[PDB]
């Protein structure tokens with residue numbers, strides 16, 4: 120949909136006590152639907168990590184103006200790919216135990232706990 124390719128985050132990272140980087144420290148490859156959203160906002164790299172996928176999704180919600188109200192309780196969509204990975208019209212932003220669980224079912228990883236295979240595909244500029 121869109122393209123920028125003018126942003127490289129090194130120190131700026133997103134993490135909280137609920138589900139921190141200690142548990143979500145796995146490499147991800149470009150193929151599923153979850154990482155297809157951040158690939159258009161501003162993420163043109165070979166391979167990303169599970170912790171970096173949360174940073175690219177948070178920047179789009181702040182710049183496009185998704186959550187704007189006095190009493191923060193629930194956010195609304197504006198007819199975009201945001202409601203195609205989760206499959207809901209409205210969701211909670213401060214609830215970290217509801218958004219991370221959905222990201223764990225629609226993605227691919229390199230190192231797994233059980234013996235499983237997915238494929239091999241890389242995209243870069």
Ligand SMILES: O=C(O)C[C@H]1C[C@H](c2cccc(Cl)c2)[C@@H](c2ccc(Cl)cc2)N(CC2CC2)C1=O
Pocket residue numbers: 133134135173176177178180181212213214215216218219
């Ligand atoms: O403190 C808070 O409760 C919110 C805070 C942290 C929040 C977050 C951090 C780590 C894991 C998760 Cl799941 C969520 C993070 C965020 C990141 C990604 C999404 Cl999809 C939704 C929210 N944002 C950026 C938001 C647009 C402004 C925050 O402002």
